[PDB]
Design an enzyme around this catalytic site. Structure first.
Site, mmCIF file in Angstrom:
data_model
loop_
_atom_site.group_PDB
_atom_site.id
_atom_site.type_symbol
_atom_site.label_atom_id
_atom_site.label_comp_id
_atom_site.label_asym_id
_atom_site.label_seq_id
_atom_site.Cartn_x
_atom_site.Cartn_y
_atom_site.Cartn_z
ATOM 1 N N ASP A 141 11.656 17.777 -13.972
ATOM 2 C CA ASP A 141 10.279 18.220 -13.904
ATOM 3 C C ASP A 141 10.177 19.599 -13.287
ATOM 4 O O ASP A 141 9.252 19.878 -12.510
ATOM 5 C CB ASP A 141 9.405 17.203 -13.156
ATOM 6 C CG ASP A 141 7.927 17.388 -13.434
ATOM 7 O OD1 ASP A 141 7.589 18.024 -14.456
ATOM 8 O OD2 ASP A 141 7.125 16.901 -12.621
ATOM 9 N N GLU B 145 -1.758 10.337 -3.855
ATOM 10 C CA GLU B 145 -2.622 11.325 -3.230
ATOM 11 C C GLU B 145 -1.832 12.029 -2.138
ATOM 12 O O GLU B 145 -1.073 11.388 -1.392
ATOM 13 C CB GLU B 145 -3.853 10.668 -2.618
ATOM 14 C CG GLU B 145 -4.622 9.796 -3.606
ATOM 15 C CD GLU B 145 -5.908 9.230 -3.013
ATOM 16 O OE1 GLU B 145 -6.230 9.579 -1.852
ATOM 17 O OE2 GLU B 145 -6.592 8.446 -3.713
ATOM 18 N N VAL B 146 -2.030 13.334 -2.032
ATOM 19 C CA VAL B 146 -1.196 14.180 -1.184
ATOM 20 C C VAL B 146 -2.033 14.908 -0.132
ATOM 21 O O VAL B 146 -3.077 15.470 -0.436
ATOM 22 C CB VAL B 146 -0.414 15.203 -2.034
ATOM 23 C CG1 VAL B 146 0.452 16.104 -1.168
ATOM 24 C CG2 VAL B 146 0.398 14.479 -3.081
ATOM 25 N N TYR C 216 1.120 9.930 -9.346
ATOM 26 C CA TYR C 216 1.163 8.550 -8.824
ATOM 27 C C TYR C 216 0.850 8.497 -7.329
ATOM 28 O O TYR C 216 1.212 7.538 -6.619
ATOM 29 C CB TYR C 216 2.513 7.893 -9.124
ATOM 30 C CG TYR C 216 2.936 8.074 -10.568
ATOM 31 C CD1 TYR C 216 3.561 9.238 -10.977
ATOM 32 C CD2 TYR C 216 2.670 7.098 -11.534
ATOM 33 C CE1 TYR C 216 3.921 9.434 -12.296
ATOM 34 C CE2 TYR C 216 3.041 7.288 -12.865
ATOM 35 C CZ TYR C 216 3.667 8.466 -13.230
ATOM 36 O OH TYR C 216 4.060 8.699 -14.536
ATOM 37 N N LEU D 58 -4.830 17.734 -0.322
ATOM 38 C CA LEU D 58 -4.245 18.878 -1.048
ATOM 39 C C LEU D 58 -4.471 18.671 -2.521
ATOM 40 O O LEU D 58 -4.789 19.606 -3.252
ATOM 41 C CB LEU D 58 -2.732 18.990 -0.801
ATOM 42 C CG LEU D 58 -2.282 19.571 0.539
ATOM 43 C CD1 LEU D 58 -0.783 19.410 0.740
ATOM 44 C CD2 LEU D 58 -2.660 21.030 0.648
ATOM 45 N N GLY D 59 -4.280 17.426 -2.949
ATOM 46 C CA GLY D 59 -4.477 17.046 -4.318
ATOM 47 C C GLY D 59 -4.064 15.614 -4.608
ATOM 48 O O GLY D 59 -3.720 14.836 -3.709
ATOM 49 N N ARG D 60 -4.111 15.284 -5.893
ATOM 50 C CA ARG D 60 -3.995 13.919 -6.376
ATOM 51 C C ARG D 60 -2.933 13.956 -7.444
ATOM 52 O O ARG D 60 -3.245 13.880 -8.637
ATOM 53 C CB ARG D 60 -5.344 13.457 -6.945
ATOM 54 C CG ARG D 60 -5.368 12.113 -7.698
ATOM 55 C CD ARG D 60 -6.487 12.068 -8.779
ATOM 56 N NE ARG D 60 -6.048 11.401 -10.018
ATOM 57 C CZ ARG D 60 -6.060 10.082 -10.242
ATOM 58 N NH1 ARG D 60 -6.491 9.212 -9.322
ATOM 59 N NH2 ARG D 60 -5.645 9.619 -11.415
ATOM 60 N N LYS E 194 2.713 12.095 1.007
ATOM 61 C CA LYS E 194 2.460 11.637 -0.336
ATOM 62 C C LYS E 194 2.261 10.137 -0.275
ATOM 63 O O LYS E 194 3.223 9.367 -0.091
ATOM 64 C CB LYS E 194 3.663 11.963 -1.210
ATOM 65 C CG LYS E 194 3.481 11.764 -2.704
ATOM 66 C CD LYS E 194 4.867 11.699 -3.311
ATOM 67 C CE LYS E 194 4.997 12.248 -4.667
ATOM 68 N NZ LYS E 194 6.493 12.261 -5.008
#
Ligand SMILES: CC(=O)Nc1ccc2c(c1)c(-c1cc(NC3CC3)n3ncc(C#N)c3n1)cn2CCC(=O)O
Ligand SMILES: [Cl-]
Length: 327
Positions: free
Chosen positions: A155, A51-52, A49, A44-46, A67
């Site tokens: 966040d 990679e997902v 902290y 899915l993405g990076r 995650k």
């Protein structure tokens, strides 16, 4: 000598009246289960902290998000986990469904409930006046809940709000920068993402609180009702504060700085300049008039303030006339 102290107006002593095991996350013992229950399906993405991945629970075949933690400070990992476990089951909080390790590689991973998200650059244009008020009320529930439980998210931004639009289901995600509230605590200001940083972070005011999430929410709300993403678009942390001051004005900034006896970094006096307080109507136009109302503007105005003590709390917000058509 030094900044004037500050306390949260709400849920001030919520961790103080609880036992250390609730908030002392360093003494948390983490049990890592087996990851064989889950099969990686797509990057899915990076995340910062990690990679997902979209994964699959081999046993029930139900969809999941994994995650995989890069090597991170054991301390931060325990914090996120402890925070996730304390807030689990709460309204609109993402569910930590498991904590696991790959038997062979040993890389730790957190496993979450999956939300069938529409990317916010596709979603937000579709959204009606009713939509925005509904989803803002869903976010508010997550933030009231989590503030009441002694925790700041730190966040809040469109990336960490997962929306399954079909199901009108919202989840507040990525608790990796979240922290426990202890009154008097001087915190790290290197948090939130640039566009959503409150002025307390930018002027280096450390004794901040839940009200940081309320600024960030306001930034989100402004981008949504005005159709300008991000609303405050700074080229760095200094210039971020210049972008805010060009809207809220320089007089209320300097009055905020003096009130808290904040030592302004010298880089600021050259770049800040002199700016009047702009009316929120200045941002309203034919393409977004339909999402703006007197109530929207008044609610926005009571979020986006320099003085963090003067912002709406998440409970006060949920009672604002803006939400009457939803409540
Ligand atoms: C998991 C976490 O705490 N952070 C994180 C970081 C990057 C992420 C995501 C979550 C998700 C993500 C996506 C979905 N859903 C979309 C349809 C695939 N869901 N759903 C629930 C969660 C959680 N937690 C979740 N997280 C996608 N990315 C990639 C972002 C990028 O590289 O720009
Ligand atoms: Cl930190």
């Amino acid at each position: 000598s030094g900044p004037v102290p500050s306390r949260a107006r709400v849920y001030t002593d919520v961790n103080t009246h609880r036992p250390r095991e609730y908030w002392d996350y360093e003494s948390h013992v983490v049990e890592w289960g087996n990851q064989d229950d889950y099969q990686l399906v797509r990057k899915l993405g990076r995340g910062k902290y990690s990679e997902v991945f979209e994964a699959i629970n081999i046993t029930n075949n139900e969809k999941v998000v994994v995650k995989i933690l890069k090597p991170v400070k054991k301390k931060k990992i325990k914090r996120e986990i402890k925070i996730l476990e304390n807030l689990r089951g709460g309204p609109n909080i993402i569910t930590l469904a498991d904590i696991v390790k790959d038997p062979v590689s040993r890389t730790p991973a957190l496993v979450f409930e999956h939300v069938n998200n529409t990317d916010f650059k596709q979603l937000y244009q579709t959204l009606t006046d009713y939509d925005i008020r509904f989803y803002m009320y869903e976010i508010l529930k997550a933030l009231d809940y989590c503030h009441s439980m002694g925790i700041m998210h730190r966040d809040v931004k469109p990336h960490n709000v997962m929306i399954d639009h079909e199901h009108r289901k919202l989840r507040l995600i990525d608790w990796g920068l979240a922290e426990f509230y202890h009154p008097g605590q001087e915190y790290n200001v290197r948090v939130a993402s640039r566009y959503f940083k409150g002025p307390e972070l930018l002027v280096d005011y450390q004794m901040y609180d839940y009200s940081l999430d309320m600024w960030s929410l306001g930034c989100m709300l402004a981008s949504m009702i005005f159709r300008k993403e991000p609303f405050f678009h700074g080229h760095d942390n200094y210039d971020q504060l210049v972008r805010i001051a060009k809207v809220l004005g320089t007089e209320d900034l300097y009055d905020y700085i003096d009130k808290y006896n904040i030592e302004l970094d010298p880089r600021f006096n050259d770049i800040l300049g002199r700016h009047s307080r702009k009316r929120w109507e200045r941002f309203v136009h034919s393409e977004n008039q339909h999402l703006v109302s007197p109530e929207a503007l008044d609610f926005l105005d009571k979020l986006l303030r320099y003085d963090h003590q003067s912002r709406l709390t998440a409970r006060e917000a949920m009672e604002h006339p803006y939400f009457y058509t939803v409540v």
